[PDB]
Amino acid sequence: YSYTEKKRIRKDFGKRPQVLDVPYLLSIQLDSFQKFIEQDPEGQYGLEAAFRSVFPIQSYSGNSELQYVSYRLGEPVFDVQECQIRGVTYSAPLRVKLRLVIYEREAPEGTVKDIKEQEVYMGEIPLMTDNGTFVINGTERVIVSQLHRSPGVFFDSDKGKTHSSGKVLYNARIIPYRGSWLDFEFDPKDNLFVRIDRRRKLPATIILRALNYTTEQILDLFFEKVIFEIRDNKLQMELVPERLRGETASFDIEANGKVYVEKGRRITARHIRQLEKDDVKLIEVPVEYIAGKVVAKDYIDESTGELICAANMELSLDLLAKLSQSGHKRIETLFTNDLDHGPYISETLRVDPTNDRLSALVEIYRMMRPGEPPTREAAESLFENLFFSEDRYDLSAVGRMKFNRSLLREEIEGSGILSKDDIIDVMKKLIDIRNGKGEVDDIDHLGNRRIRSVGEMAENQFRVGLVRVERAVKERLSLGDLDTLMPQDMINAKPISAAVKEFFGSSQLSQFMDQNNPLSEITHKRRISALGPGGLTRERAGFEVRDVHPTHYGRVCPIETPEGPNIGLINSLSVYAQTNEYGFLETPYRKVTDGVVTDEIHYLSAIEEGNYVIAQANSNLDEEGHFVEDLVTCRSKGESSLFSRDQVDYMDVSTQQVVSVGASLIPFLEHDDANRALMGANMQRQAVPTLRADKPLVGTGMERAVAVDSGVTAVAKRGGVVQYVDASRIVIKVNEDEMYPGEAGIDIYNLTKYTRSNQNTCINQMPCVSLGEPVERGDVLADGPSTDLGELALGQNMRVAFMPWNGYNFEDSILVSERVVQEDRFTTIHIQELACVSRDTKLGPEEITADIPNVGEAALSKLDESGIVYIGAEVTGGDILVGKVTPKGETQLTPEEKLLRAIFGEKASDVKDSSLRVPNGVSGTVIDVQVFTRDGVEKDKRALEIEEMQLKQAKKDLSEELQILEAGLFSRIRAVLVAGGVEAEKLDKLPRDRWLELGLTDEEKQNQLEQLAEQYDELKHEFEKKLEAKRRKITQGDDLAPGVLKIVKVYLAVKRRIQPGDKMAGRHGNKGVISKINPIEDMPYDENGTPVDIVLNPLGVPSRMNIGQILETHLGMAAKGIGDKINAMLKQQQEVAKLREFIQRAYDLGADVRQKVDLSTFSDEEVMRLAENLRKGMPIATPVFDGAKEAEIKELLKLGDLPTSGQIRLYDGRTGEQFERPVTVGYMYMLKLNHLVDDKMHARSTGSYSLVTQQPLGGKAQFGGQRFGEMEVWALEAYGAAYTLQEMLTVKSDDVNGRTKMYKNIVDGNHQMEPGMPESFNVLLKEIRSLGINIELEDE
């Protein structure tokens, strides 16, 4: 047990013990980038690897070589926080040592000179935070891991649809990690073909010739040999007795003076056995049997020296005669069978246009780059640079691995390029599949699916950067002089920097972390995608890949995946899942040796898991863990059924691992249909943090792990006692055992305070500990947004009643009491960052000055002398946050305006008001202001005030650091001095500064005192340098965009509670929109007089089948019961005994659960705190599929004083009369998604307009009007409304005249329209007429 577990404990139902506990949920993200940037003294993936690949770069034959030595990542220019505030990128300089050697022309190889240029700078690269996040511009971002087709070879079917002959086809595909694709495919005529990439189809053998294989050797490779002998006269044949299988006798088969088979008798196993035992090597055959046989090799006349027959040519009765008289004894032919061993390659040669190697290379080079005249060196260079070049091609490790494995090879690791043996073996495998031996693989299987991650992809982009820098290096090394340039002038920065910046900045996989929520972050960081680079698209891949595969078990969550344009093209990583060594997906299991189920953990990949029979997470075993049933439900290969007691190799580790962390937070999930469950776990990520982090009243037990593993909370680095607790910071004094000898020290935690979150919500941390409290190592020292006492509260539980209330709950609609909006529980805090830009126009510079044309004293009131709003001033819509004015000269007025100015004597200002004003309707309080200034332009008054303030605050902070740290350090010297030197009262008298002189008796403690001295002075100077650096960071002008002189950022904190139109939902996939806010007066209540918070609609329950939401209600009620009872017994102030008794009774609950319990806990000061935290309700943990049962809940209801049915009598708060029938009341945990109505709501009358085509367009955040589409138009057409439609697409929108001419009539009180012609069609006329097309408008 831990220390916050003494604060609060969650009652846990369920039986199955957890053999393995949930690992770090952020594992994958951190591991990836940990591999990317790192020093690996070998070819393993990392910057080192990608470096070694392209390097060393040598010039063209000129013997000027540039080789790579070693690299380093400098310390970040700005730390996480500073870089987040300022808005720059959190990164490190990449400093790489390069050695430029120049070989003395005319080797033996030695260098005239080699300049080692010290660490030339190329690019800065982003860094991953401890939370697995990146900051691109001042914003936390995540790179989603990718799922693609693993490299190597793959054999498919493509039966059915092609050709409709049903004959199917068989194709192989070699997909490298990088480089051109290699494809082989058959056709209806059984002619083997080959294509590089998706390009033109070529006869297979044409590649073989390019490997320098003459026809004879191709045949020798793909066919066996049938030997014909002309011994004496009239032939003979060599016969392997197995050759006659699957064939019928073509003639009398007789040898050894004994007739084995006659004519017309198919050769069976009998004939074959007879031939085998009698051992007949040579038989006599007719001269006519070779009429169809194909001659293996070439044959010439020894005398005439002329070619008798070419290789792979059909023999005739005459050709035999023509090669027989020439003195030929032996004739080799192809062994061909239309069933067993097929004659494919022969016919393939029959379709081959080429002859020799050069010819093949010609057709290939003319295939890849067609239309341009081929050249020998060109074809050679191409073909050698396709699959055989170390540069332009590679499968890497996973590729070579899967390649060799699928080829039934031995070697698990090999070269990164293809070999003749490789291509040949692949072709052989394809031919074997067409022959009937071997099977075809499927893509959907997770063994063929590889998982990438941040580091790998970043490595790829950096690789592209390195190749484009390589081209430049060679380009310059072409003409270069000797000892002038060095590895600086060549290598640039921007090419690489933008190469990585383009990846992190804009990519489909690189996105902004969704931080509205601790679950959202952690479930985003664990995610998979089949989209992006190196993957399919929604418009391409069909239903197969999207669909769930049995291999998804334990690897990928079946029920968590977005519902929309891409379904199952994303999914999520499962709970206990891990990335395999080679990059596949493997899940934990339990090895079952003999008859015992062992607790040893074993990880099996998608392919590893295949043959083994795995048992069930839900299975009955006892004592030693032997299976209770004689047969138990299991799954072995692709399928599940009942299995013998001991046939079982393995078993599931947990009742969880099938699902993900999102689904694992859904209580009573087993009681919910998969559709609504999916919707539930989908919306659970949308929950906006509440004002008061509450707690789930009905839990799972994952919510602790989610809260802790996600970076939202603050966890103790080391255990000890709290020296200091503030809403700002928390200082813990470290225990000695955990403490390091030097520096002594205490752990100081600076808590994040109110600040902007990516979703504009609020992120703020509060201390969960009090002054002088014991804290265990790895314990929550504070809670983040939407977290309570180390658990995850995504929302707030509350009283719910199921019953129709006056149709206000009508569809999914939710009827909530006033008690909720009054208690401000569902209230939310939004932090909006608003910006003001001071730019440069040709008319002049823009000023932030407080002097604003046309504003009242009340308008300039909330602004200081400089024109920026004070910190803390509450503002609403229309208030001026930052005064800004831009020059616009010579207004060029008109006559009546001129008379007006002449009468009123008003000077029309040369300046126009651009001031940043709070967006319409939104209202909040200003929590901060920042001023970014171009370096070298004078800081204004306000900015200076702020700068000085920040300087002082910094000095105070640093001074606090040094004080707490120094006192903490000397407090150790006091303790060590007392051992061997002890003077209690004598020591603390003299000044502390002079303590360092005092020694000690000979011992290691003297050297300890020495340590404390060294580290003390270290801290003392470190303070100095840190102060200096902080000051410089404050004063320096941040680099801004072109034209912008200065920028003012105001941070508004808006507080919106709840109003009709907001979206709310449970964890069960039941949505709703708050309909009306009903007084506590009209609320249905019970006999006790306690009203209900929320009234749902029962009708929503049966149709969409989620019954869990009802169970969640019931248990919830019962849970609250245990609270209320305790709430009374605390209000009765009984004693420790009664309380403890009741609590224990609650935590036991009938029989057979795994929870255990107390009275190892201090019976007074500890227990009474737990009971104090339990009075709000009794938190319960319902495991995913291991969760509670009806009987357990009813029992808990008995303990609660509440009915079994979970239904009580309810009275209308209006009439006061009872409602007929009982109604279900309880506590259902409910969230608030951020759909909030004051966001969604939009209205526009007359706004701005698009330039290119005049159409309504919002430029002000004042929204463009709704889009009237084709379907809406049809809807108008169906009715008889012509004028509604005309006014819709003419005057209200597209007519540059009609709109204004309309407006004047609308204000004049005349409703008409003078439509004219829409500008769209008017432009179409010009576009058409711009061509050679004359379009005109006839008649009148």
Binding site: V77, P93, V120, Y121, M122, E124, Q488, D489, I491, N492, A493, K494, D935, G936, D1039, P1042, G1043, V1252
Partner: protein, 52 residues
Amino acid sequence: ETINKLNRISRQMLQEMGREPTPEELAERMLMPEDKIRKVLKIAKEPISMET
């Protein structure tokens, strides 16, 4: 040509300064009044395709 001259400085002074030269560095590095950088650096840029 004036723009190109401003590129040359950027090259060396990029790695030389460890990040990049300040917007006013190449200014004194170049002959003319040197405040023209911001001006010259502006008009040089090619307009982004409106169809982007």
